[PDB]
Symmetry: D2
Subunit: 257 residues, 4 copies
């Protein structure tokens, strides 16, 4: 495949419906060797199962809230891999209040801090900790959503955080690009993942993009996965600082009228 020999670390694989799952499958299919992170010892066995699914026994703890775990993640990976060619950042969190109902009602200094810490800061944080072992053609990929660009109901503080995340893509691209490293995001359409249970009225968004997107269909983790594999590969050698929509074209319309 077009990722033959590429070694890629994936965060955020929580279930078989996770976006990271779809990316993992496409990457493995195209020849990559994979490693995975998880959060909390309670989940080690589940991720080891998932990892086995993709021919991997490389799983490491990483709570991105903790500097020590971020550094220890790459120290551990480094015992197995001399170089890292790909990093998939598929991680996000905000307190339920901060993504329910009215934007201001859920706004507190702490809710803001946590959302931005986990959902935005963590991406350039992992990039920085990974840097010493990044191959010169490495590719860093994060996941965003249209709520970064336009106000979407309930998304609220996550929208602010995703806006900072997309900006981080641009600044990381400049910082790491001289070396040859690329940094991109996929702005994915809604997909029924575990995280989607967080978003109130996820169902309504889903119906709405099915009915209004140019392709008149929702995207799948297979589609987001294949797009991700492309960006992580040398096929996308000329692409950096890009936020690529993989959402059936929904971002490009005004729907519902």
């Amino acid at each position: 495949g077009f990722l033959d020999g590429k070694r890629i670390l994936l965060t955020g694989l929580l279930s078989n419906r996770s976006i990271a799952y779809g990316i993992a499958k496409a990457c493995k299919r195209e020849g990559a060797e994979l490693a995975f992170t998880y959060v909390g010892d309670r989940f080690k066995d589940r991720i080891t199962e998932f990892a086995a699914e993709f021919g991997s026994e490389l799983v490491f703890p990483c709570d991105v809230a903790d500097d020590a775990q971020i550094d220890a993640l790459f120290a551990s990976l480094k015992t197995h891999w001399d170089s890292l060619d790909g990093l998939v950042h598929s991680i996000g969190f905000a307190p339920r209040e901060a993504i329910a109902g009215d934007f201001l009602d859920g706004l507190t200094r702490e809710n803001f801090r946590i959302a931005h810490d986990i959902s935005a800061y963590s991406f350039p944080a992992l990039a920085k900790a990974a840097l010493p072992m990044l191959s010169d053609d490495a590719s860093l990929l994060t996941l965003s959503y249209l709520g970064a660009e336009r106000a979407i109901p309930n998304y609220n503080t996550m929208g602010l955080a995703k806006a900072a995340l997309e900006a981080s893509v641009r600044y990381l691209a400049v910082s790491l690009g001289a070396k040859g490293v690329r940094v991109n995001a996929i702005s994915a359409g809604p997909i029924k993942t575990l995280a989607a249970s967080g978003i109130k009225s996820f169902g309504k968004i889903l119906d709405f993009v099915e009915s209004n997107s140019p392709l008149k269909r929702n995207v799948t983790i297979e589609q987001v996965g294949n797009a991700g594999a492309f960006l992580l590969s040398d096929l996308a050698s000329g692409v950096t600082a890009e936020v690529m929509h993989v959402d059936s074209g929904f971002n490009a319309v005004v729907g519902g009228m």
Copy 2:
């Protein structure tokens, strides 16, 4: 003037070159009554002078790092004003490291947190604390910069924070808009303010927009001020969730070639 009888609170007036100074002058010129905030008792007298300059004796402490000062700000203002028609958010900060040289070198969890806390969170925080006394036609205005949209050298972590700030404009507009309140930003071009001493190679950016902007000239606080007064006024009744460039058109070109 077109702000006759409007009552407007301005943050961020640090000197006579501050963007807030220019906005204040244009607002006063157009008939507004003004109030001002300041940071630290060491600065109370300077701001009282500035305020006197605009026919005001209404100055209040507000360090946006402190929830208690934010709430006390509007409690105090409320003893003088029954309603608030305008709020100017002209406040920003990042640790010098986070805006010098390479993006990653200056990246730390704490530098990130502080930049976003002060430069982004503070805007919807003030909006929320002001809400009870906002008139139905009130207008909230913040200041951003092109580094939010595109990577600019040295701007670094401030770029991430300004990206979150512009997103906050959109979500605030939805939250406060039913009531009739508008929320906008001006993305201003470079202006030799005290804050600009922070940015390394501010001089180079300045020369570059003078030479490459369509108007072949840098903007002034008078120009940004007049634009701000417009947005704060009923003239801009149909305008919300907008990031308006007041930068001699520089954002719209690719210059230097």
Copy 3:
């Protein structure tokens, strides 16, 4: 007013609901002297009435399909006015087929040509013919719509034409900016004008932005007019190459979900 002594030529005033009507009223209110164009002798008397409404007896024929009328327009104006400070381009047309139903069904080389000729070319064409008599602080303004940025049902070929029009704003700004002349567009929300009778399901768009815009209300020609007056004035001295949304913030949301 803030347009005291400015002399401004307005195209596209077809009725008292025209966007140009609202702009004219705001400009006159702020002190401008106005002149108007019309299309076809059949309409001379109606426009003279409208013009009288704003204290003007300056009306001139200009079908923008005809080079000769464009040049004769400014030759005639020049007999009355030594200089021109403002130009309002509020003109658009596509064959009904090209804006009904499916984009491709209405697509023909000729429909395309006409839409772009009238709706896009005409703006920089008038700018070029006006140039010799433009004051150094003159301001050129055109009207666009969100269909330029995102696909909207039925808008079709007009969307392509408005995209070219907004690009023309940027290139005109660079061409005319050295001299000091500014060039901008207002992307207006839907307004029940005569032109709106063209757009099938204008009613549905109208309801939809009322229900989904942050301000939960449609814009008025008074609002678009005041925004236009601002851009045409020295208040907007720092603003060029800008497409300003005056649409109750609708562009900034994803609505209907």
Copy 4:
């Protein structure tokens, strides 16, 4: 490869440095069968050579200025191919005057008409003529440039035309998407093609993106080609109405300062 069995028609292959050449190579490499168009009998033999290079004897005349040639193109192709899976639109033209020096100096009704006719109209025109034989998973791809989004020196009227072209991508995506067909553009960085000899100071743009792009290098037709192959493939099943930058990230920075 990931285009196994896909049948793809490419326009605009003029030389071995053409962007279409690079796309053709990547498509053939990934398993596609190709067909080609050319302009003028004088060029039939050159394109037959090029086509032989990619294992093809399918070459057809198509001057996009001529409706009859557009329809005859697909009638002819249809004698060889039952279905069409991919279309590459890599065609552009403006009179030299319209892309030299000042935007207005080169502006004439005819120069405008020709640029938009050839560079924009031709894309949805080919899509419409191809429609009856398009497979349900077909993918249409056109080539654009950053001058569509921001004013670039000399690009002038081509910038207006490319703006209309990118809009056409969005409207075509909605029109053809119900069927399942995708429509996208690649906004490519500068590449020393025959067409680039048109652009005055192409050399300066080239140096400038090498020095300022995040990757600090210019893109190649190999890079644009691989990106194109991806978009034309089922790998990009979730991607439509997208303008993908393949320009070393240059669009995402403000350079030169």
